[PDB]
Each structure stands twice: as C-alpha cells, then as structure tokens.
C-alpha cells in the first residue's frame, strides 16, 4: 500500500474538510474572531423562511442544537471534530463501495468506467429504489430536467447514511440533523473535496483495513507538530500522542497476553501454531510450576474471556485481539458466521478520549466481522468501543423524569438506588475528555451499573418519543463506567506518550493525587492503572518508552512492580523502533506483566536494540539475543532495582558482598552561583593577587581580605587524574555576593550548597560527561559548583583508593548498569561497589596523579606553569634535534600512565570477582594526557598528518611563551608566572630588581604585530633575538629555518622563496591572533588592536598592563611616528615609478599602491584613536574580558567574535 | 585534509547543548550568546580544513548579513565567517527544541 | 573535483603568450591588458574547482590590494578574485621574458 498517497492526502484532506466546514458555517451564521470567539444573530422569520446570514424554517430547531454545542465546545473544536467525522463517514463509504458491502451494489462515490464521474448519477432509480422507495417518482423527475445533479447526489448519499445508522450507530446517525447541515456542496465539481479522496488514494490502498489506521494517523499528522513543546490542551491531546504501532509489536503483545491464558489452561491448544511471537515460558522451577497450576482454571469458556484496550487509537490492537479470539473460537468449534457477534459482544472492549479514534476503531472491527459474516449488518450488534464523554452540560432533572423509570407520571424516588447510582457516576466523569481511562471505578459497582445499563438499553427501544431521546444521552456514560468497573483477563495498549511539561493544570493534580509513583509521563500512569483492571491471574502487556526501566524517578514504581507483579516476557527495542518518526527522541520496550506475584518467576528478555525496525522484527521471530538467567528477585539486588536483564552473574553478585562507594567517600554536589557570566572567570582574566592561587613568587602574605577569586572545580572535558584547573569564582566575604544574590522579588537566586567542604582536598569529576567517567585530584584551596561535583574523604588513602577506581573502565562498567545516560549524579554513583583498601592501588594512583599534574602544568594556561618544556634540555643542541628529543619523551610518558591505569583496572577486576572479557582494558587513545597524540587529535587517523599536526601545536606553544616573555608575563631569570595583575602596577619595581635581565621585557607593552620590520622592539625582531639568546648564534639559522618548516605544515601555506624570517612574521600578523583566540578560549590576555583590514597598524597589548594612558602612548610613539615614515617613503617611491621602464616600472607600482591604502586607514584609525584616547578609559579586570572588550568599540579585532555584540562605533 | 560541515554543525550543536545547561537558559530571549559561541568554537582553524568545510553540503558561499562579514583582506577570516553564520542560522532552528529538551530534562 | 593553481597559472601563462602575439605588444607600457584578461579567463567557474585551486600551492588567502577585492556578499567572487590577483602578479614576473621571447621569435 502506497501510504505516500495517503500521507500526502490525509493531512491536506484534514484541511480540505475543515475549510469546507468553515464555509458551511458562515452561512449557518456561526463564525469566530481572528483569534476565536463565537457569534450568532437570532434568526430572521420570513413567514416560514429563516435567513441566517437562507434556510427553511423546520431547519431552525436543528440549527439551535448547534448554537448550543458551539457555546459549550468551541469554534476550532467543532470544525476539527465534524470535518473528521464526515471525512470518516465518507472514507467508510469509499471503503464499502470498493468491497461491495452496499446492498444496492453500485459505486457510491466514483464511477468504475469514468475517472471523473459518479455512478449513482447514471442509475438514479436503482439507487433510489433501494434507499428512497417513496421518493422515486420525485427523484426520477429531477434527473429528467438534467441540470440539478448536485442536488440529486446529495439526497442519495444521505439516504445511504441513514441506512447505515442501524448497524454502525457510532458513525452514521439518523435524525443527526445538525450533521446533515455541514455536508458541503460542490460534490460533483471537478474541484470537489471528493475527487481528492478517489484521486489521492489509489484503490489498491483501500484493500486491507490498516488503511483505516493510516488514514487515522496521517489525518491528524499536521496538527501534531504544532501542539508539541507547549502544554497540550485537553482538546489537542489525541493529536500530540497519536502514533501507529507496527503490526509485529501488537502481535507479540496480544499473543503473549490473550493467547497465554488460553494456553495456560489448555496447554496443547494449537493456538501456539499461529502466534509466531508467542514466547515460551522459561523452564520455571517445579515449585512455581506447581504454584501456577494451582491457580489456573481447569477450563475457560471462549466467551467469558474479556479483553480491554484503554487507548486503542486506530483499534489497531483490537484487530489482533479479534484475530486471536477468532482462532480460539475456530479451535473451540464455532460456526464461521456465528463468531463475529460473540466476540464483539462478549470479548472485546475499547476506550479512548478521541471521539473519532473510537469511530474508526469500531469501523475497523466491524469491517473485520463483515469480512466473515455477511449478515452481521442486520443483527443488533452492540460494540464495546466507545469514546469517553464529559458531563458539564447535562439537563439532569429533565432526563430522570423523562425516563419515568418507576413510571411516576402516568423528584419522586431520590432515596431510590437508580438516582443514587446515577449521580455517583456522573461525578467520576467530570473531566473525562482530560482524564481518560484513568478514572477508576470499583468492581462492586459493576453489577449495579450493568443492570442499569441494560435497563437503559431496554427503555431506549420500548419507550415513547420522550424516554427514547432521553436514555439515548444517558447510555454513553453508564456504559463506559461499567467498562471501567469490569475486571479483565488482559489489558493491552500502546498508551500515549506525554511528559509533565506538556501536561495541563487539571491533569497534573490528578497525577499527583492518584499516581504518585508514576506522575512523570502518561505511559507510566497507564502501566500502573492497568493492574487495577485485571483479574488476579490477569496480564498487563503494553509497549512503552524504556525510561521506566532505569530512571530513579521510577524506583518507587519499579519496586512496586517487582514485589506485587510478575514479569513474564519483555522485548527491549530501544531507538528507531517505529519507522515513521525522526529524531533520537524515542526509545521503547514491550513487555507482559502478570497481575499475580511470583517471587521465583524467571522472565525471558530479548535485547533487540540494534538495527532499524526491520532488523528487530527479523531477530525477534528468530529468537536472537535472549536473556533468561535472572529472576525478578535478582533485580532487587541492583540499587534502584533497574530492569537490567543484560547483566552477567559475577557483576550481580558483587553487589551483595561489598560496601557501597558512597558509604566511604562523601559525594557532594556543589553550589549554583545563579550567574556563571557574573561570578565565574578564567583565572587569567583577573589579578593573580586577587586569586587564592599560591604563587611561587609572592611571599608577601596573602591578605584574605583582598582575595576575590577562588579556583573552582567546574567539571570540564574528559580527564583522568588532575587537570581542568581553570575556573575561578567570586567568593569574597565568604560569598556575600552569592548568598545574598536574590531575584528582583526576594526569592533567593543562588544555591550555596556544602559550603563547609570548600577549600578542602578531595576528588572531582565532570557531572555532565558525554562519554566515560573519571575523577581528578583537587588540592586545597578549591571551591566547586554544580557542573563539577567533588567527593571527599578524611583518609587520604581512601581518597586515593577511590580516585584510582573512579577512573577505571571497571566503574564505567557499573555506571552502564545503574543508569545509561550522560548524567553521573550523586544517586547512582553512590551505590557502586567498593572493596577493601588494597595498598598497591594507592601508589599506582599517586604515580598516575603526578603524571597528569605534570602534563597539565606544562601549559601556560595552568597556574602551576613553570616555563616552556623546550627549556629543559641543553641549549647547544640543534633545535630540530630537540623536537625529536621531546616527542620520544612524551611517548614514553604515555606508556607509563597506561601501564599504571591497566594495572589499576585488572587489580580491581580480581578483587571484585569480575570477568576480564567484559571489562576491556585501557587503550592508548584513551590516555587523558595532552602529550598523547592519539587522544589530543581524535580526528586525524593518519600518521604523517597526525605527526605534522603535533609539530604545529608545539611550535605554537613555544611562540606564545616568547611573546609572554616579551610582555613580561614570564621570565628566563625567574621560574613560573611573573607579572599578572591589574593596571600595570609594580612592573617598574621588577625592572629595578633585574627580573628580566636575560630577555628584556618590552618597554610600553605595545608589541607592533606588523608584516614589515618598522620598529626594533617588533615581535619578530625579538623572537629572532630570543633564539639567538637561547640556542646560540651558532645554531640560529638551522634553528630559525626549522621554525618555518613546522609552521607551513598545517598552520599556514608556503610561498616560493619566502625567507624563514618572513615566514615567521607572516604567521604572527595573520594566524597568531587566531591561535591565541583559540588558546585562551576567546578571553585573550594579549589584545589585538587593528587600524583596519589593510593591516595598516596592528599591535599586541597585555591586558593586565593596561591603564588610562595606554592608548595615549600607542598614539604618541607609534601611530604618529609611523605616519611620518609612510610619507617620507611615499615621496621616495614616487621618484622611482617614473625612472623605471620595461617590466620593473610595473613591479614598483604595485608596491606604492599597497602602501598608500595603509596611509588612509591609519589616518582613519588615528582619528578614532584620537577619540578613545582622549577618553582615558580605565578597566576593572574583575569585570571579565567579555565586558571590557566592547568598551572600545571598533578599535579592537573580532569584537563580536569575543563580546558577541557588534562594536559600538562612535 | 578532509572535514565536513555536517561534522562541524555536530560540534556546534553539541556546544550549544552544553552552553544551555551551564547557564540555565530558559527563554529564547537569553539564548543568543550560547548559540554564537558554539558556532565560533566549531570553525576549523587550518586553511586545508576550512576549504574542506566549504566544499561540503549544508553551507553556501553567499552570505546573508553584511555586518557579520569582515570587510577584510583576509579571506580565511571570510570563509571562517561564512561558516559561523551558517552554524548560527541552523542552531536557532533547533532552539525551541533544545530549550524544550533542557527544560524537559530534569523533571524534578 | 580537483584542480591545481599551477594548472591555472599554466593556462593563464599560455593565454598571455597568445595575447602578446595577437596584438603585437612590444614595450611593457602596453602589456597590462593582455595580462589581466589572461588571468580572468583562467579562473575556475565551479565552486568545487575554485576551492580546489585555493587549497593548492602558489596562492595564499590574504589579498594585496583592496580595490581588486569586491566588497561583496558573494564569496565565490572573492575566492575568484584572489586567484585573479595571484595570476596577474606571477605573470608580470615573466613579462620582460615574454616580450623578449615574442620580440625574439620572428628574427626577420
Ligand atoms: C493510544 S495513543 C494513539 C495511537 C494508538 N496507539 C493506535 O494504535 O492507533 C493515545 C490516545 O489515547 C488518548 N488518551 C490520552 N489520555 C487517555 C486516557 N487516560 N484514556 C484513554 N485515552 C487517552 C490520546 O489523546 C490519544 O487519542
């Protein structure tokens, strides 16, 4: 079947039918404002003609039963229902003329031998003879005028629907006067809505019945995507939760539920022969085997079994229950023609809130029974597939005396049990359109409700005009209530999926008051409520989202399940199970849970989480990937009690025998500052004197009054032993800013938690970690927030012993059981095993931590940074031979940590009595060191391109240090960080202390980053001065030529004959700013001022070394002296273009041209630096770098890449 | 030296999932920054890689908004700008989805 | 979809050999046009090819002269401009060689 014709048509057919009902309402006098507000206009009385906007007068009482319904229901609500219901009434006629189910047998909507005609037009008398016998001579005289074909086609189609009111009353009503008025006109035009129904759906698509389900799903498809994300209105629920389950899941469900009970009583029932999805009860213990046979009845009558889908939708599930009862009656020996009546009446019951999902459902089931019994259409066939109804609109007192039940008129009897039972039930269904089949009814009221429902049926046919219309309104409620009061042998359904942030105000409080253990999603509420609708030995079998199996928000429930109910069989599907959904928003699982408790019971599991829907259907029929080795009492041993069938044995038995990790290490969640952009900074954004970082060069006491920024373990990326020490927070006056930080109304905004554990030694991990899990060492002087949870012990050995564990794959083996997500919170991780303290691990961890501290501290982003790792070897060796020396060193360090990590893993594996096949050891590409090229470069797989990439970052790391030396941030004479605090204070006191006597620190802090040597304190000039100063004038050229080789590898592209020095100056003025952006995470400490995009003047400025008069000096001794050079050289270049001819005069022109555009830019950059320099702007380093970078408008570079906001020009 | 834009959008998309969680962004009126940074941090750095991204599907060579285009002699910045803009546009098209996904991720 | 700049300079270089012969250019004071056209006619037209040229040796991504750079939202024009400029610069570096080669090619 080509659903594409359907999928394209049904959503458009929804809107065709709606707009066709809206233009029939405008004449009916019913409309709404642009937003939605009803309107009427009494009605004009022209003798016996009512002109509303033009209609007979007898169509006025049937018009004012529609003005009724709108006031209480809504304009956008009635269109959607009535365009759905007529679209339903027609698709059922379209379906019944193709299967020739009409007694008159002529095509009713199309013409077999005419793609554009209608066959009932040609046989007007035949079609009328069957339907309108007395109106033939009048219909015969119309088609004999030849011009009223639209008026004739309408008289018949309605005469067909009144005819269908007897056997299918849920869809075709008779004195449904209100309906017949919304039937559109223009049914015989080339643009009638009808043509699309014949032309948009090939007749092949109409053969099977599931088409009903595809119509069902696709029709409502469009309104779904709008009602998502928001809260779903009570009227939009069916849209936001309507799917269509693959047939092979419904078969598993109905056959492992309905067929199971008939099998448990008559074991050799051949029924098993059809069910291919029937799972075989695992070898049960002969005790439970003996328990189950003492409960099963010795005999079940086929017509005593009673099944219930509380949310059928397309009835898609009921069709299967109908199929499996069909082979119970075929196996029991009942006449083929006698089966449909006995199933639909005795066995199948259905419910739903979508009045129209019940219309289609009952048709799909009646098209099932007509495919087997041609005369079912003649019998009085009551269907137990009703939609739930509200009761905020009933004329209660008019109907109880229109009933005349006790026959009082030839409120009497308010102490009679027919009034007391009547009023008790109308209150349970106050908000039924919103509560659905979740409103419970006691089984004690079954008999009373049923006995009164059949009496209401009685007086619907034996009463007069008053008792008949009256009881006809009452039955919808008493029936659905009796359905709910009845207890069933099995309840199957694909319940609706809707989270609490789509649930509405009425549904939330009902969830809190009736379903505490499963208030989360609707599918849990259905799973729990279905148990209260089952006989003792009844079965519950749904298909649900999988989260109820692992989330600790359901532990209350998973414990309720494991103790009172019994797991029979589950099929764990996972993602992409449904093949008409996009987005990883869906993962699923199916199951069957008996309503009896059997502790020792052994359930069978099927791990079908891989492949597309097609893959799992194959593997299920083929019984692949089975787990039948763990009872529901074994899942009680895993904390939280997660269904975790996929477990092994030794991992299950390690839980009963050891103490929990939490019992020994205090896992503590950090604070929540309330504002990460206000209170958190990178430790280099602010002063080093204003941070609680114990520097190696400040023996002057750390005034704990002056300290404003404290390092904060803020999670970060994957890292195994020490790193991620980058984030400092504002904890001045013990958090006087964060504690008192309230909202604008007074409700406190920040969440200072565990403020007692601050400044302590402990371990830290990334609470939010996409991949594996790992902790780190965290020395004294740290605070921590919520993104970086930290665990503390007092015993430093237990702290280290836990550290080495919490980085092993052994822990990521346990964290996959307790909860498969990305959240490594404090609940699941506390229940991890934790064996006795072995002392061999405590030393392997300390070797590990210091290797990972040494790797981290090797970067200029770590406060424990010392100096460039190149400065550790002999300065006489060639520099290109020193690179080879450091690559061979960094690879040995990786094997040292890898052998330390694997020995920690395999040791933990032996103590916990685990299996080494399951826990894979640590590979090389998993060592969390920055000197490990297989982890730092996950992208490049190659070897020559993986080598050159590493060569480039090392080249950059040593370049950012020579510039750091130039700015005064580091020194060859003094180890570690040197100058780094606000306003260039104290820099001069260090020059008189010979703090930089080896390599001089630049004069003003303005390093001209230009593409030609104009100044002597120019960056490139000083880099050459740096290599000559370190590795010798002897190797200056071999060392410098080698820096151009490594830069042109990946960083930039080569040029022919571009000298090694011009190669380094080119990287600097083009690519270095990029790499320093990347290197400090857009929070640079060397800011790049730019004249423009000619690069007429660019210079680096150390953030810390900035004061009011900095822009002044940049203009005095640079922007001014350079413009008198440009002029003195542009007049000397205009002497030279003239004196050249041939090819050389051309060569000199292009050089006067590139230099003149730099004189106008620097003239337009000076008038803007004359504006911001007269301002004497002074910065507060505490404000962060995002904030200060926008104060300067467009004097800086990438102001929007950094600040996010464009540069405010002036 | 290959690298696809779809690869790059995936990093950017993941950057923004983190950025929303690290700042507790709730309404779109405060989502702008988290989207801009996620894009900028995902742009490739090498000339070989940046060209590779352009040559791929999901990104064209005509900008939308001149202001985001550096009037500049540095074409790697330009091609680098064009990838920023494309990433931001696509990210906003999933903004309500994520704000819904992150709002709908606690349920507590 | 590969194409090297050295491939492109070869077409441009050959364009200029023809251009000098078809107009009888003798002094460099009249060579400017023939060089500009030869470069423009050699720029690739497809996005796939133009990126391929950039990624190759002999051409960088920073212009020399803003005027030749279309201040434009159309980056294929820009990358297309950058290849024009590089071609013209290289061609002038062989101008006297060709003017000598074409002057020295008749000998009659
Ligand atoms: C079961 S699904 C629809 C798809 C269906 N599985 C099928 O096979 O066609 C959800 C349906 O039941 C409705 N619903 C919501 N809450 C309900 C409740 N408490 N009882 C019954 N139906 C409910 C939804 O609005 C929707 O119409």
Author numbering:
A (entry chain A): 1 to 53, 56 to 412, 426 to 1225
B (entry chain B), C (entry chain B): 3 to 110
The authors write:
Bacteriophage Exclusion (BREX) systems recognise and methylate 6 bp non-palindromic motifs within the host genome, and prevent replication of non-methylated phage DNA that encodes these same motifs. The PglX N-terminal domain encodes the methyltransferase, whereas the C-terminal domain is for motif recognition. Our data demonstrate that PglX is used to recognise specific DNA sequences for BREX activity, contributing to motif recognition for both phage defence and host methylation. As a result, the PglX structure, and lack of nuclease motifs and potential aligned catalytic residues, supports PglX acting as a methyltransferase only, and not acting as a restriction enzyme.
Ocr is the T7-encoded restriction system inhibitor that blocks phage defence activity of the E. coli BREX system. Within the asymmetric unit, PglX-SAM binds to a protomer of Ocr as a 1:1 complex, with the single protomer of Ocr binding along the positively charged region of the C-terminal domain of PglX. In this complex, the Ocr protomers perfectly align and abut one another, forming the equivalent of a solution state dimer, and the size matches our analytical SEC. We therefore concluded that this heterotetrameric form represented the solution state of the PglX-SAM:Ocr complex. Six salt bridges are produced between R79, D35, D42, D62, D76 and E109 of Ocr and D1213, K1201, K1097, K1070, K1110, and K516 of PglX, respectively. The complex is stabilised by a number of hydrogen bonds between Ocr and the C-terminal domain of PglX. Also visible in the PglX-SAM:Ocr structure is a bound SAM molecule, in the same ligand binding position as seen in the PglX-SAM structure. The PglX molecules from the PglX-SAM and PglX-SAM:Ocr structures align closely with an RMSD of 1.34 Å (9564 atoms), suggesting that binding of Ocr does not elicit any substantive domain movement. Within PglX, there were again two regions of the sequence which could not be modelled due to insufficient density (residues 54–55 and 413–420). Collectively, these data suggest that Ocr acts as a DNA mimic, capable of sequestering PglX and therefore blocking BREX activity by preventing recognition of target DNA.
